[PDB]
Amino acid sequence: MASEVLQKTRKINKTLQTSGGSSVSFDLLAGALGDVLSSNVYVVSAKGKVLGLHLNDVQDSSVIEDEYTKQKKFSDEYTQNVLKIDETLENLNGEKILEIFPEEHGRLQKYTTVVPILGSGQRLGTLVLSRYSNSFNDDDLVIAEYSATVVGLEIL
Amino acid sequence: MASEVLQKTRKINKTLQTSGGSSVSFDLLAGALGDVLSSNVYVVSAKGKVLGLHLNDVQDSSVIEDEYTKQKKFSDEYTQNVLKIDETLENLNGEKILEIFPEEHGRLQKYTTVVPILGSGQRLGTLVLSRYSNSFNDDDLVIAEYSATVVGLEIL
Amino acid sequence: MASEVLQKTRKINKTLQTSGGSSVSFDLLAGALGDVLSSNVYVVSAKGKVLGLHLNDVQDSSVIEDEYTKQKKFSDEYTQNVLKIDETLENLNGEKILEIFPEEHGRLQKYTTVVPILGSGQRLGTLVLSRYSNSFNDDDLVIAEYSATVVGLEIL
Amino acid sequence: MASEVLQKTRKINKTLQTSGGSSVSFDLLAGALGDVLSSNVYVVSAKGKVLGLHLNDVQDSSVIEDEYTKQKKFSDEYTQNVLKIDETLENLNGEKILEIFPEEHGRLQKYTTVVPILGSGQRLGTLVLSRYSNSFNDDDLVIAEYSATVVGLEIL
Amino acid sequence: MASEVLQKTRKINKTLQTSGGSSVSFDLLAGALGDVLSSNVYVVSAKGKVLGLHLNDVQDSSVIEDEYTKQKKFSDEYTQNVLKIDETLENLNGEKILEIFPEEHGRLQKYTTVVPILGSGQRLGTLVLSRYSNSFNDDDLVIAEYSATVVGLEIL
Amino acid sequence: MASEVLQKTRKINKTLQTSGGSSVSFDLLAGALGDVLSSNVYVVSAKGKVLGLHLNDVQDSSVIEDEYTKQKKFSDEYTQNVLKIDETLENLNGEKILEIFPEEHGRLQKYTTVVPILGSGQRLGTLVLSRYSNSFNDDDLVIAEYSATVVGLEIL
Numbered sequence: 023m024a025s026e027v028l029q030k031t032r033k034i035n036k037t038l039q040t041s042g043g044s045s046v047s048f049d050l051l052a053g054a055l056g057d058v059l060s061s062n063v064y065v066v067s068a069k070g071k072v073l074g075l076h077l078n079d080v081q082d083s084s085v086i087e088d089e090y091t092k093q094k095k096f097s098d099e100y101t102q103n104v105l106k107i108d109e110t111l112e113n114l115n116g117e118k119i120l121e122i123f124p125e126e127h128g129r130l131q132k133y134t135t136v137v138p139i140l141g142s143g144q145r146l147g148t149l150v151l152s153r154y155s156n157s158f159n160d161d162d163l164v165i166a167e168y169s170a171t172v173v174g175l176e177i178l
Numbered sequence: 179m180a181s182e183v184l185q186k187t188r189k190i191n192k193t194l195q196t197s198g199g200s201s202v203s204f205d206l207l208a209g210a211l212g213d214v215l216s217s218n219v220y221v222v223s224a225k226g227k228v229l230g231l232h233l234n235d236v237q238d239s240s241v242i243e244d245e246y247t248k249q250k251k252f253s254d255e256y257t258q259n260v261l262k263i264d265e266t267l268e269n270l271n272g273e274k275i276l277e278i279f280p281e282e283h284g285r286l287q288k289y290t291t292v293v294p295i296l297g298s299g300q301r302l303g304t305l306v307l308s309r310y311s312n313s314f315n316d317d318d319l320v321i322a323e324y325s326a327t328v329v330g331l332e333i334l
Numbered sequence: 335m336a337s338e339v340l341q342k343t344r345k346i347n348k349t350l351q352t353s354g355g356s357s358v359s360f361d362l363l364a365g366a367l368g369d370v371l372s373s374n375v376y377v378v379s380a381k382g383k384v385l386g387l388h389l390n391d392v393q394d395s396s397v398i399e400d401e402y403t404k405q406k407k408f409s410d411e412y413t414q415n416v417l418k419i420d421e422t423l424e425n426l427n428g429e430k431i432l433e434i435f436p437e438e439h440g441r442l443q444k445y446t447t448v449v450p451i452l453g454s455g456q457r458l459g460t461l462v463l464s465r466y467s468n469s470f471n472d473d474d475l476v477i478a479e480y481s482a483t484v485v486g487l488e489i490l
Numbered sequence: 491m492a493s494e495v496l497q498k499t500r501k502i503n504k505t506l507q508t509s510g511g512s513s514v515s516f517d518l519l520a521g522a523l524g525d526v527l528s529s530n531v532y533v534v535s536a537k538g539k540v541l542g543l544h545l546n547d548v549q550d551s552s553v554i555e556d557e558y559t560k561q562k563k564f565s566d567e568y569t570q571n572v573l574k575i576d577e578t579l580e581n582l583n584g585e586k587i588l589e590i591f592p593e594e595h596g597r598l599q600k601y602t603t604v605v606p607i608l609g610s611g612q613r614l615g616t617l618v619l620s621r622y623s624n625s626f627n628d629d630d631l632v633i634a635e636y637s638a639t640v641v642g643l644e645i646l
Numbered sequence: 647m648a649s650e651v652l653q654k655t656r657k658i659n660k661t662l663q664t665s666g667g668s669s670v671s672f673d674l675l676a677g678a679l680g681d682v683l684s685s686n687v688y689v690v691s692a693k694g695k696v697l698g699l700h701l702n703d704v705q706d707s708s709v710i711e712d713e714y715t716k717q718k719k720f721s722d723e724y725t726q727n728v729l730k731i732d733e734t735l736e737n738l739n740g741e742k743i744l745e746i747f748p749e750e751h752g753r754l755q756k757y758t759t760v761v762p763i764l765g766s767g768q769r770l771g772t773l774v775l776s777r778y779s780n781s782f783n784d785d786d787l788v789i790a791e792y793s794a795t796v797v798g799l800e801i802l
Numbered sequence: 803m804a805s806e807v808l809q810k811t812r813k814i815n816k817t818l819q820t821s822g823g824s825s826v827s828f829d830l831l832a833g834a835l836g837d838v839l840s841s842n843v844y845v846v847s848a849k850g851k852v853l854g855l856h857l858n859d860v861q862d863s864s865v866i867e868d869e870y871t872k873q874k875k876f877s878d879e880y881t882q883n884v885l886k887i888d889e890t891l892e893n894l895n896g897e898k899i900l901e902i903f904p905e906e907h908g909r910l911q912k913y914t915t916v917v918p919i920l921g922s923g924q925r926l927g928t929l930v931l932s933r934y935s936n937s938f939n940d941d942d943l944v945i946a947e948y949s950a951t952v953v954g955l956e957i958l
């Protein structure tokens with residue numbers, strides 16, 4: 023059996039070899055968006071990694087922690103489904119939400135907008151915004167779309 | 179009075195011009211370290227921002243949220259105090275803790291280690307580790323000092 | 335006296351040793367702004383360098399050529415005056431224009447908006463937009479200010 | 491219909507999602523070469539975009555502005571034709587020119603040199619030099635080829 | 647025939663076009679490792695380039711020079727064989743060395759450790775450590791593995 | 803006293819915290835230059851470190867290994883003295899060599915050229931080229947100077 027200090031080194035190095043210990047985080051942008059829009063905000067990489075998060079409604083989170091790697095992500099199905107949206111999809115509600123996010127069966131009154139994140143004309147991730155009561159308008163789409171473009175510039 | 183959309187744009191742009199809306203996070207590394215050392219782990223930039231966090235003992239957290247900017251940080255006092263430590267300070271306990279972390283009245287019954295984070299021989303931050311019951315030993319310090327070294331490689 | 339090839343090599347290398355002989359250009363963004371706002375657009379570094387330019391009204395250009403590099407720039411007075419402006423100045427018209435841009439003598443019926451370009455809370459340049467006939471509104475400011483912010487992210 | 495502000499935002503974002511709205515200008519280098527060679531100098535990406543320009547003879551420019559982006563470029567013909575040259579071609583004069591540059595109809599007395607720009611063993615671009623009266627010699631080629639090689643270094 | 651200056655310019659440029667005339671080196675890390683492990687240390691890219699080297703025992707080096715690129719490297723068979731090793735291989739000694747390194751016939755008394763270098767869960771290279779007399783222990787492995795991991799962070 | 807594993811980790815980390823363990827080598831450019839010019843070539847940072855080396859005449863190397871690190875450098879006297887040269891110094895020979903390189907007493911028949919390496923208006927290092935029998939001519943200087951400028955661009 024490897025010595026304890028070598029086993030622990032190996033666990034740290036697996037974490038490193040996977041990620042660089044270091045992740046880019048758009049939590050500050052997601053929070054500002056969340057505040058202005060009173061919304062759950064997810065900044066999701068194309069591979070499904072949650073790079074930024076703000077929860078207005080903590081009970082409604084679709085974030086899952088990878089049991090093995092501890093990395094915050096969307097499910098495999100959620101990850102794939104958002105990539106099928108190639109232009110902004112606004113005000114998804116109520117049963118139509120299940121076409122894209124099948125596990126939303128208590129949350130179908132919500133308005134959800136999905137914004138592709140593109141950098142150098144490539145699909146790099148997705149911005150997901152969702153709230154109760156009030157549909158998003160075009161002013162909200164301005165903010166959402168330029169924020170997504172900014173993420174794209176920072177991940178590119 | 180500015181239109182609602184211009185007011186919200188200006189909020190987003192304050193977040194962006196400040197941070198971008200981006201940050202480097204060391205939560206995965208802090209989690210692995212916290213796991214293998216059974217410790218509270220804080221990766222704290224030179225200016226006090228908490229870039230990586232793991233809480234083994236959640237009630238003992240010394241993180242505060244900035245009112246105005248929203249960021250996780252140490253207090254000015256804590257921020258300045260950890261910069262006075264220029265080499266690894268291991269197993270700070272019980273009343274000596276108060277020199278560095280004065281708000282520790284109830285937890286002088288812990289072992290706390292402070293490790294400078296250096297990159298290109300410049301002080302970029304500080305790694306703080308704290309736990310109950312067992313003092314840190316030299317194997318623990320190997321893990322902690324190489325981890326701090328890695329953080330410094332990734333901020334630099 | 336050095337051979338002609340060596341003299342010419344030396345001149346080229348002076349250019350390379352200074353700059354590379356490379357700069358960053360925002361002409362693509364300045365063109366897109368200029369199109370959507372029907373304006374003359376200048377992206378000006380803090381030191382006075384015109385990094386992006388679009389002319390809707392070619393006759394009204396304030397661009398001058400640096401004697402010793404042919405680099406496009408603002409005059410020293412224009413350069414220093416725009417740095418004194420620390421927030422968006424919208425719809426500068428007609429004679430107040432002269433407080434900032436003193437050589438605007440047959441162009442005072444123009445509307446000019448001046449947007450600081452900030453990155454990481456630092457002043458890195460300025461965006462200047464000018465057009466005839468129609469004042470800028472708050473929607474125009476949204477576009478101007480988020481474009482200025484993007485420049486700040488790309489220079490930073 | 492999307493609101494005006496949203497449509498303009500979307501135009502700005504297409505520019506950014508594309509290019510960012512940023513380029514890298516070899517105008518400085520082109521100018522230095524243009525000066526020492528008394529030449530029109532074109533630094534042209536593999537895809538035809540004019541990244542640097544100096545005009546000793548302004549009437550003779552082959553630059554066109556893209557109808558949409560307004561980006562300076564060579565025609566599709568000129569762009570594809572320069573990629574047919576895999577080694578330096580010096581002193582193209584006046585009937586061999588029609589094979590590569592067909593719309594040089596009155597400029598057949600000119601001496602034109604085409605130098606591939608190579609970097610990390612890929613063809614990244616082409617440097618085009620042209621002047622009247624004086625053929626280019628091997629000293630000129632030294633200057634031109636190292637300059638092309640440095641562009642190759644700075645795109646790569 | 648090209649003038650001599652041109653021909654020599656073209657040789658230099660072929661090196662600059664290829665590599666720049668630059669590599670990333672890990673000699674300083676290899677030297678620190680070789681000192682605290684009294685070992686020959688090889689930092690080897692997956693393609694076989696020797697990026698870092700320290701020789702405690704100069705006569706035993708396996709480094710060869712590529713005739714064309716000039717780069718230090720391992721032989722094709724050494725290169726391919728270390729890539730088959732997917733976990734740390736500790737204390738290769740005796741005849742078994744020959745399964746991995748077939749040219750070690752005068753040197754079978756040595757102990758060799760082979761550590762994969764991984765970066766973002768991809769195989770980027772290999773760390774090779776070798777010495778006489780003393781087997782490597784677990785503390786040696788800690789140092790070797792975290793050093794390998796840091797190479798991976800720096801090549802990634 | 804700290805455990806052996808901790809003391810060795812601390813040595814490794816001093817190397818890392820310092821440089822990364824990483825550095826940039828100009829060995830490939832130095833080899834290309836020492837081949838075209840049949841010369842010893844040293845690419846030397848402003849602080850004296852040998853970044854690139856080629857030896858046509860191995861016995862005449864002025865490289866020393868740092869007593870502690872073993873890092874390759876010039877002596878402090880050589881390091882100081884090259885920075886007193888602000889323009890190319892060509893064909894330093896025979897007793898004058900000693901004003902700059904005082905330890906050259908068996909090597910006074912050589913021709914040595916010293917080229918400042920400049921990048922973004924700063925003195926970054928020095929290129930030193932040395933050979934028996936033939937003085938350097940202006941063509942040699944072209945190659946040296948442009949190669950120095952390229953090192954400048956790559957360190958900068």
Ligand SMILES: CC[C@H](C)[C@H](N)C(=O)O
Nearest residue numbers: 062082083084123134152
């Ligand atoms: C990603 C699906 C939705 C938006 C999420 N469950 C929420 O309501 O926040």
Ligand SMILES: CC[C@H](C)[C@H](N)C(=O)O
Nearest residue numbers: 218238239240279290308
């Ligand atoms: C930062 C001071 C100490 C470490 C902290 N309160 C803890 O026990 O986690």
Ligand SMILES: CC[C@H](C)[C@H](N)C(=O)O
Nearest residue numbers: 374394395396435446464
């Ligand atoms: C810089 C001053 C103004 C904006 C400029 N002359 C123009 O009208 O385009």
Ligand SMILES: CC[C@H](C)[C@H](N)C(=O)O
Nearest residue numbers: 530550551552591602620
């Ligand atoms: C690109 C073709 C030639 C070179 C160009 N029209 C010139 O004379 O400048």
Ligand SMILES: CC[C@H](C)[C@H](N)C(=O)O
Nearest residue numbers: 686706707708747758776
């Ligand atoms: C790569 C094989 C071994 C390790 C090498 N010959 C040495 O003894 O250093």
Ligand SMILES: CC[C@H](C)[C@H](N)C(=O)O
Nearest residue numbers: 842862863864903914932
């Ligand atoms: C740096 C001094 C001289 C150049 C060196 N000893 C050589 O002959 O290579």
